[PDB]
Amino acid sequence: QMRLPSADVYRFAEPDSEENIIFEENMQPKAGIPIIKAGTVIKLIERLTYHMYADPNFVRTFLTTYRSFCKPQELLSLIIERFEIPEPESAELKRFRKEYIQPVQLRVLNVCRHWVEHHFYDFERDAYLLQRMEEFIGTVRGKAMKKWVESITKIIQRKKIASSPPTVEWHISRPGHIETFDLLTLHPIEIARQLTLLESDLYRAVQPSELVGSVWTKEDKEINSPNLLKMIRHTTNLTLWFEKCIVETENLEERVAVVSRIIEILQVFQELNNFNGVLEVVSAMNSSPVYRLDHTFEQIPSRQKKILEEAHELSEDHYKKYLAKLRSINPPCVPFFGIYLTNILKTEEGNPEVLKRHGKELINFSKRRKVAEITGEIQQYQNQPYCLRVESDIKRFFENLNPMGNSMEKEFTDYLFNKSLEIEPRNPKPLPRFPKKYSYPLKSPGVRPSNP
Amino acid sequence: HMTEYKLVVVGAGGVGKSALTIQLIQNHFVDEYDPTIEDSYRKQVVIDGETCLLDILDTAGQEEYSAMRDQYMRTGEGFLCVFAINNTKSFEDIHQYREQIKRVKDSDDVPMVLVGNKCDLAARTVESRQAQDLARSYGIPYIETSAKTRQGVEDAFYTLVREIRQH
Numbered sequence A: 001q002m003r004l005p006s007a008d009v010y011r012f013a014e015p016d017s018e019e020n021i022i023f024e025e026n027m028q029p030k031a032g033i034p035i036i037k038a039g040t041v042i043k044l045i046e047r048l049t050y051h052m053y054a055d056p057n058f059v060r061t062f063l064t065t066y067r068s069f070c071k072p073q074e075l076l077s078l079i080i081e082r083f084e085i086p087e088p089e090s091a092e093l094k095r096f097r098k099e100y101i102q103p104v105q106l107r108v109l110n111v112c113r114h115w116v117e118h119h120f121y122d123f124e125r126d127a128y129l130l131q132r133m134e135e136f137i138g139t140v141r142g143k144a145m146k147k148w149v150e151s152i153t154k155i156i157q158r159k160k161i162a163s164s165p166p167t168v169e170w171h172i173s174r175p176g177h178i179e180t181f182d183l184l185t186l187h188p189i190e191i192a193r194q195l196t197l198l199e200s201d202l203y204r205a206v207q208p209s210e211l212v213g214s215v216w217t218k219e220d221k222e223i224n225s226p227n228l229l230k231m232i233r234h235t236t237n238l239t240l241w242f243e244k245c246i247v248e249t250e251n252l253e254e255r256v257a258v259v260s261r262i263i264e265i266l267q268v269f270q271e272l273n274n275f276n277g278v279l280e281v282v283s284a285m286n287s288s289p290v291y292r293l294d295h296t297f298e299q300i301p302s303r304q305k306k307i308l309e310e311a312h313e314l315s316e317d318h319y320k321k322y323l324a325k326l327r328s329i330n331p332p333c334v335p336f337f338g339i340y341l342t343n344i345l346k347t348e349e350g351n352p353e354v355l356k357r358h359g360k361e362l363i364n365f366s367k368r369r370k371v372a373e374i375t376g377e378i379q380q381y382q383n384q385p386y387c388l389r390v391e392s393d394i395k396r397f398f399e400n401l402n403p404m405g406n407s408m409e410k411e412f413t414d415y416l417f418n419k420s421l422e423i424e425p426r427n428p429k430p431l432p433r434f435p436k437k438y439s440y441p442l443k444s445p446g447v448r449p450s451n452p
Numbered sequence B: 001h002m003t004e005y006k007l008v009v010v011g012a013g014g015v016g017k018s019a020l021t022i023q024l025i026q027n028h029f030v031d032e033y034d035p036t037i038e039d040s041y042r043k044q045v046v047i048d049g050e051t052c053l054l055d056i057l058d059t060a061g062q063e064e065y066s067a068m069r070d071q072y073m074r075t076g077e078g079f080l081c082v083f084a085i086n087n088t089k090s091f092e093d094i095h096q097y098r099e100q101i102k103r104v105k106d107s108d109d110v111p112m113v114l115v116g117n118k119c120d121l122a123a124r125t126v127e128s129r130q131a132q133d134l135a136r137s138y139g140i141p142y143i144e145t146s147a148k149t150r151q152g153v154e155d156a157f158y159t160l161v162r163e164i165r166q167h
Ligand SMILES: Brc1ccc(CN2CCCC2)cc1
Pocket: A259, A285, A286, A290, A291, A292, A293, A294, A296, A297
């Protein structure tokens, strides 16, 4: 057993106890390291830079979630304090330098490296935090550390700077004829592909900084969760566009064609593993103005009814089937973000920030690990892109969709419902007839590609 | 087979509406919650002597997916319409939620309760009499709950089951 300095000269030398650190009964599966349940910030910083072993999962978890219990400015100070190890008050001293000082000092530099590499937003948002980090990194001397100091400096400067896919499908609208682009004129395969690309990019731009601390639900959500909000708004927008397409097609035969085409787009979203796209369609079909359109549903081909019913069933029983299906597939995919949002919020709200042991407050770290596990799952689906070519005009059409126009939510929502009542009145009012609005053929080109 | 009641929690986001269900499900002396399992949204209870199962849907965090409300609401037999006693906008939003439930269920009489939640130690802006008058205009019960103490939580849910049984 080694001789570490006094707690009066070095706070991280204080021994472990029930009053400053507690563990879970299990160990890290692949590493054999104990799982920290809670501890004081001093003890969490000690274990973040432990001398006996490296702890990458704890470092990653810590750096993703520490802001709920410690400020960036306070963490930097704590790690600068950790690095400045005093010699205790020879054989004993030479062992202390090789078994405690060199390992700990290398561990703080590794934390510095991970911080700047994966969580640079703390430095972007506080230029003094970066000034202090460079001051610290500039004071670090040693041949062992020159390698790690140089690599950090390279990351800071980099951060301060800032086979064949298938053939694009065309139906009635021809390339460049953006004025005619619509639900029934664009090829259903290409709608689904171009929407999958938009929705994949939106999904991939959401960072853990927008999710940790449930900040997308708070007063400053527009500042802190902009990419997430753009993603949800695209989704909401597409659902409303589908509902609008349906209820604004007053002629029954044409409305059946519209619904049937949306089911084809859904079928292609299923092929592409775009679960956000799938649920955009299911949400439109389950909306009040669409769900009540029984005369339209009855006229839908039996194969398309079953396609829709199975998609609808993915949401039943708290997304039981959706969850099973997401686990079974491999990337690329576009998950539905909402489940993660509810899980992160409930983890944060349903667990205390602190645990108390013998009257002493311990930061509840397990709560944070649980949140970092959810953000890690989000990230595992953000690495792989799709092998699909972008069509800049179709992409721009879907980016600029605005079914609501200048109307507010309620006004538009009521207009959709009143259109529903008009086109298919409540029983016993008989079904009226309405004139056709489309001057092009309603027949679909199908969901199988046109060329090999 | 015992009766299963499919309950839906609705209300404004950002005002701790999730505490209602979390406090119900988690044992009165347990604070370790995992929302990623079945037992987190299902609870076997005895109400007025009759044992039953409560399946509770709370989509807290998904408020911006506004076009998914109808889908989520149609899953329910009974609704808890939640507002925060310190957020007047969340109270004023209730009328919209109720009207949407009525449209989704296609009924003027849907089993429903109004829940005023005390989510923190910030100042109350909605007096109990305001909420009691609103609940009376809708013809439904009003229950106040405390997020810190668990007071009123069981009463809110049990009252809703009674509203379904007496429908
Ligand atoms: Br278009 C359309 C119209 C109606 C519905 C909902 N129905 C409820 C029972 C069968 C489907 C979906 C799509």
